[PDB]
Each structure stands twice: as structure tokens, then as C-alpha cells.
Write a protein that binds this ligand. Structure first.
Ligand SMILES: COc1ccc2c(c1)c(CC(=O)O)c(C)n2C(=O)c1ccc(Cl)cc1
Ligand SMILES: CS(=O)(=O)Nc1ccc([N+](=O)[O-])cc1Oc1ccccc1
Length: 121
């Protein structure tokens, strides 16, 4: 669920999920169409794609638990929907962490019309 994810994001990047990530590029937060504008945008894209493989789960409201083994994010045994979700968020977390150095503000609050193009997961 978002609470977990957001907290995971803050620990990892030091930036707050909302609003640093709720309206970035074409895929962070609003999902939908387009060509990811950048690495972070791709992270979000691969992430939306991750929730896409769990049709009958509820990434948003289902809560899972995770811990840190020295800085490592470690998803704890829960329902199977819970485990698979958590893996999906961990990746996004890492991913964001891996491209902080190219996180660009001109993609904050990006207008929808500039998000057209095709991309299959
Ligand atoms: C590729 O992108 C997707 C696809 C489906 C999604 C989401 C993101 C998010 C993610 C979001 O809002 O960031 C949620 C919550 N999805 C569903 O609940 C869902 C539920 C029931 C059926 Cl039968 C099919 C899909
Ligand atoms: C899930 S939605 O319809 O895509 N809204 C939404 C998108 C991103 C985030 N977030 O924390 O990164 C949080 C989000 O929603 C909330 C807004 C305020 C308080 C709690 C959740």
C-alpha cells in the first residue's frame, strides 16, 4: 500500500513521494500513456508495469511489511499479493535511488499532452 511505498521512497531518496514523485514525467503517479521522459520516468514505467502483472491484487491499499538488513530492503513473508507488491516497490525505490543524479525538476507537474507515444510492458 502507498504508506509503505512512500516511506520506502523517503528512506531511499530523501525526497518525499508526494510531490517529488506523484506527478513526475509521464508515468510517476498518473500512469497512462507516453514515452518515459527519463530514467526516473522509466522507473515509474517499469513500476506501473510491475503492478500490471498482479491483476487481482491491490497495490494501493494492501499493506505489507519490510525491514532493512543494513540498508537492504527486505520484504517479509505475508500474503502472496503482499510479497509480490513489496518486490515491486523495492525495485522502484532502488531505481529512484539509482538515478537521483539525473532527477530533473522540469518534469515536475508535467502536462499530459506532452505525453504521447507507445510503450508496451
Ligand atoms: C500498467 O499499469 C497499471 C495497471 C493496473 C493497475 C495499476 C497500474 C494500479 C496502479 C496506480 O494507480 O499507480 C492499480 C491499483 N491497478 C489495478 O487496481 C487493477 C485492478 C483490477 C483489474 Cl480486473 C485490473 C487492474
Ligand atoms: C494513488 S493515486 O489515485 O495515484 N494518488 C497518489 C499517487 C502517488 C502517491 N505517493 O505517495 O507517491 C500518493 C497518492 O495518493 C494519496 C494522496 C494523499 C494522501 C494519501 C494517498
Amino acid at each position: 500500500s502507498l504508506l509503505e511505498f512512500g516511506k520506502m521512497i523517503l528512506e531511499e531518496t530523501g525526497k518525499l513521494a508526494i510531490p517529488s514523485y506523484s506527478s513526475y514525467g509521464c508515468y510517476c503517479g498518473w500512469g497512462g500513456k507516453g514515452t518515459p521522459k527519463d530514467a526516473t520516468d522509466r522507473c515509474c514505467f517499469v513500476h506501473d508495469c510491475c503492478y500490471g502483472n498482479l491483476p487481482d491484487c491491490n497495490p494501493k491499499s494492501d499493506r505489507y511489511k519490510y525491514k532493512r538488513v543494513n540498508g537492504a530492503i527486505v520484504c517479509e513473508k505475508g500474503t502472496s499479493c503482499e510479497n509480490r507488491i513489496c518486490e515491486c516497490d523495492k525495485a522502484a525505490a532502488i531505481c529512484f535511488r539509482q538515478n537521483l543524479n539525473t532527477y530533473s525538476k522540469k518534469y515536475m507537474l508535467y502536462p499530459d499532452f506532452l505525453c504521447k507515444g507507445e510503450l508496451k510492458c
